[PDB]
Design an enzyme around this catalytic site. Structure first.
Site, PDB file in Angstrom:
ATOM      1  N   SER A 163       2.038  15.492   4.609  1.00 22.40           N
ATOM      2  CA  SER A 163       0.687  14.954   3.932  1.00 22.40           C
ATOM      3  C   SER A 163       0.781  13.319   3.723  1.00 22.40           C
ATOM      4  CB  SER A 163       0.650  15.781   2.681  1.00 22.40           C
ATOM      5  OG  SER A 163       1.699  15.253   1.804  1.00 22.40           O
ATOM      6  N   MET A 206       0.829  -1.294  -0.114  1.00 17.87           N
ATOM      7  CA  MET A 206      -0.096  -0.096   0.044  1.00 17.87           C
ATOM      8  C   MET A 206       0.889   1.135  -0.170  1.00 17.87           C
ATOM      9  SD  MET A 206      -3.470  -0.859   2.294  1.00 17.87           S
ATOM     10  CE  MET A 206      -2.701  -0.698   3.837  1.00 17.87           C
ATOM     11  N   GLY A 207       1.943   1.167   0.490  1.00 14.29           N
ATOM     12  CA  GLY A 207       3.168   2.145   0.447  1.00 14.29           C
ATOM     13  C   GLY A 207       4.137   1.764   1.673  1.00 14.29           C
ATOM     14  N   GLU A 208       5.115   2.782   2.032  1.00  9.59           N
ATOM     15  CA  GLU A 208       5.986   2.457   3.029  1.00  9.59           C
ATOM     16  C   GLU A 208       6.336   3.630   3.771  1.00  9.59           C
ATOM     17  OE1 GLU A 208      10.153   1.447   0.807  1.00  9.59           O
ATOM     18  OE2 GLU A 208       8.607   1.018  -0.694  1.00  9.59           O
ATOM     19  N   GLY A 217       9.409   0.576   7.835  1.00  3.52           N
ATOM     20  CA  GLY A 217       8.694  -0.715   7.210  1.00  3.52           C
ATOM     21  C   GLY A 217       7.588  -0.499   6.131  1.00  3.52           C
ATOM     22  N   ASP A 224       6.842  14.420  12.598  1.00  2.00           N
ATOM     23  CA  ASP A 224       6.748  14.142  11.444  1.00  2.00           C
ATOM     24  C   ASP A 224       5.479  14.115  10.784  1.00  2.00           C
ATOM     25  OD1 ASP A 224       8.591  13.324   9.247  1.00  2.00           O
ATOM     26  OD2 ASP A 224       8.414  11.168   9.297  1.00  2.00           O
ATOM     27  N   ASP A 268       1.593   7.569  11.774  1.00  2.00           N
ATOM     28  CA  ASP A 268       3.072   7.451  12.055  1.00  2.00           C
ATOM     29  C   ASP A 268       3.753   7.970  13.372  1.00  2.00           C
ATOM     30  OD1 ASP A 268       5.601   6.428  11.658  1.00  2.00           O
ATOM     31  OD2 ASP A 268       5.515   6.668   9.550  1.00  2.00           O
TER      32      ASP A 268
HETATM   33  C1  LIG Z   1       3.568   4.448   7.800  1.00  2.00           C
HETATM   34  C2  LIG Z   1       2.445   4.102   8.766  1.00  2.00           C
HETATM   35  C3  LIG Z   1       0.913   3.633   8.039  1.00  2.00           C
HETATM   36  C4  LIG Z   1      -0.083   3.311   9.075  1.00  2.00           C
HETATM   37  N1  LIG Z   1      -1.314   3.253   8.516  1.00  2.00           N
HETATM   38  C5  LIG Z   1      -2.425   2.765   9.135  1.00  2.00           C
HETATM   39  C6  LIG Z   1      -3.611   2.625   8.449  1.00  2.00           C
HETATM   40  C7  LIG Z   1      -2.635   2.859   6.860  1.00  2.00           C
HETATM   41  C8  LIG Z   1      -3.419   2.798   5.576  1.00  2.00           C
HETATM   42  O1  LIG Z   1      -4.369   2.203   5.619  1.00  2.00           O
HETATM   43  N2  LIG Z   1      -2.762   3.251   4.766  1.00  2.00           N
HETATM   44  C9  LIG Z   1      -2.720   3.160   3.430  1.00  2.00           C
HETATM   45  C10 LIG Z   1      -4.220   2.856   2.845  1.00  2.00           C
HETATM   46  C11 LIG Z   1      -4.133   2.867   1.585  1.00  2.00           C
HETATM   47  C12 LIG Z   1      -5.571   2.568   0.652  1.00  2.00           C
HETATM   48  N3  LIG Z   1      -5.133   2.933  -0.512  1.00  2.00           N
HETATM   49  C13 LIG Z   1      -6.105   2.542  -1.726  1.00  2.00           C
HETATM   50  C14 LIG Z   1      -6.568   4.047  -2.021  1.00  2.00           C
HETATM   51  C15 LIG Z   1      -7.696   4.070  -3.376  1.00  2.00           C
HETATM   52  C16 LIG Z   1      -8.272   2.551  -3.508  1.00  2.00           C
HETATM   53  C17 LIG Z   1      -8.514   5.237  -3.142  1.00  2.00           C
HETATM   54  O2  LIG Z   1      -6.771   4.264  -4.504  1.00  2.00           O
HETATM   55  N4  LIG Z   1      -3.873   3.375  -0.654  1.00  2.00           N
HETATM   56  C18 LIG Z   1      -3.367   3.397   0.678  1.00  2.00           C
HETATM   57  C19 LIG Z   1      -2.186   3.544   1.036  1.00  2.00           C
HETATM   58  C20 LIG Z   1      -1.930   3.667   2.480  1.00  2.00           C
HETATM   59  C21 LIG Z   1      -0.630   4.387   2.890  1.00  2.00           C
HETATM   60  C22 LIG Z   1       0.319   3.275   3.316  1.00  2.00           C
HETATM   61  C23 LIG Z   1       0.061   5.124   1.847  1.00  2.00           C
HETATM   62  O3  LIG Z   1      -0.901   4.884   3.945  1.00  2.00           O
HETATM   63  N5  LIG Z   1      -1.606   3.213   6.981  1.00  2.00           N
HETATM   64  C24 LIG Z   1       0.216   3.409  10.274  1.00  2.00           C
HETATM   65  C25 LIG Z   1       1.323   3.881  10.914  1.00  2.00           C
HETATM   66  N6  LIG Z   1       2.233   4.163   9.865  1.00  2.00           N
END
Ligand SMILES: Cc1cc(-n2ccc(C(=O)Nc3cc4cn(CCC(C)(C)O)nc4cc3C(C)(C)O)n2)ccn1
Length: 286
Positions: free
Chosen positions: A146, A32-34, A38, A143, A161
């Site tokens: 956006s 989903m990303g990084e 991690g 940190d 984060d």
């Molecule tokens: C680093 C960190 C993260 C987190 N945390 C906690 C939850 C989430 C989460 O659910 N994150 C994402 C969800 C996404 C959904 N989509 C699909 C979108 C669509 C279909 C509209 O295109 N893309 C995405 C990307 C991300 C990212 C990874 C970028 O945040 N992340 C927590 C503590 N530290």
């Protein structure tokens, strides 16, 4: 259940993420990303979509996030569901954010439509409410950016984060952390203060107005915070910078958000408004 933190087995997490499939989720994989320490994978546990942060080859970022997120629970903060420590590789499990990050939504990554000015104002308000909660509870995020502002099914802003987050009961550090493009002058020198989080929020507000990333190598200026100087020196107007991917922006509310961003971006930390004043000013804007 939503009443407790769930300790998960590493093998359940490896299974729900298709063996931590590093192909983008847009291609059929699970990445989903990084984050900084991690990769975040999409998972399915208890029929529910979850986010799994695998801290691979740390520990200090595992026990920090568990400690900070056990204390800080608010509607504008990302929710931790559980963790994994047994098998090889530490894992953190979160409530999945269906609309990903503010950064990805501002850049329309993967074909998503541009965010309206109306949605942008509500996100700014929500993000400020989350920061206020953290500051009220004597936490410095360190940190604010956006990429760390996540969006749920209703586009509610959730600060995420908290790996670099710091407490209190002003301070200096030898290990300087953060994202340079968002960092206040004093934070780059090693000072630790919530006034630095306000500066970083000011850059986020500029990203919301313009839709431009904080740093762009092929851009003049390379750093988005430098547009404050171009507008002050009358070389450019805020109007010239307003994101063209919107149809509902009005000059008055854009100028009111820009004024808040300008105040947040003061080089002198004591001249910056506190988060409560930022909330007040963003509320008066709508
Ligand atoms: C680093 C960190 C993260 C987190 N945390 C906690 C939850 C989430 C989460 O659910 N994150 C994402 C969800 C996404 C959904 N989509 C699909 C979108 C669509 C279909 C509209 O295109 N893309 C995405 C990307 C991300 C990212 C990874 C970028 O945040 N992340 C927590 C503590 N530290």
């Amino acid at each position: 259940s939503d009443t407790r933190f769930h300790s998960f087995s590493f093998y359940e997490l490896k299974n729900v993420t298709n063996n931590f499939d590093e192909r983008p989720i847009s291609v059929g994989g699970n990445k989903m990303g990084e984050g900084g320490f991690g990769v975040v994978y999409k998972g399915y546990v208890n029929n529910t979509t979850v986010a799994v942060k695998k801290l691979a080859a740390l520990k200090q970022q595992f026990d920090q996030e568990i400690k900070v997120m056990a204390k800080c629970q608010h509607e504008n903060l990302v929710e931790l569901l559980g963790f994994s420590s047994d098998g090889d590789d530490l894992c953190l499990v979160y409530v999945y954010m269906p609309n990903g990050s503010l950064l990805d939504r501002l850049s329309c990554l993967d074909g998503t439509p541009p965010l309206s000015w109306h949605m942008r104002c509500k996100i700014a308000q929500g993000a400020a409410n989350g920061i206020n909660f953290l500051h009220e509870n004597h936490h410095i995020h360190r940190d604010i950016k956006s990429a760390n502002i996540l969006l749920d099914e209703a586009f509610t802003a959730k600060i995420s984060d908290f790996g670099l987050a710091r407490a209190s009961e002003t301070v200096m550090t030898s290990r300087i952390v953060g994202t340079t493009a968002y960092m206040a002058p004093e934070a780059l020198r090693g000072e630790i203060t919530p006034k630095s989080d306000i500066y970083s929020f000011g850059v986020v507000l500029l990203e919301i107005i313009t839709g431009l990333p904080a740093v762009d190598e092929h851009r003049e200026p390379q750093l988005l915070l430098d547009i404050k100087e171009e507008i002050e020196d009358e070389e450019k107007t805020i109007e010239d910078y307003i994101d063209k991917k919107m149809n509902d922006a009005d000059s008055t509310s854009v100028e009111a958000m820009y004024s808040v961003a300008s105040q947040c971006l003061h080089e002198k930390k004591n001249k910056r408004p506190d988060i409560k004043k930022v909330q007040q000013l963003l509320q008066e804007m709508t």
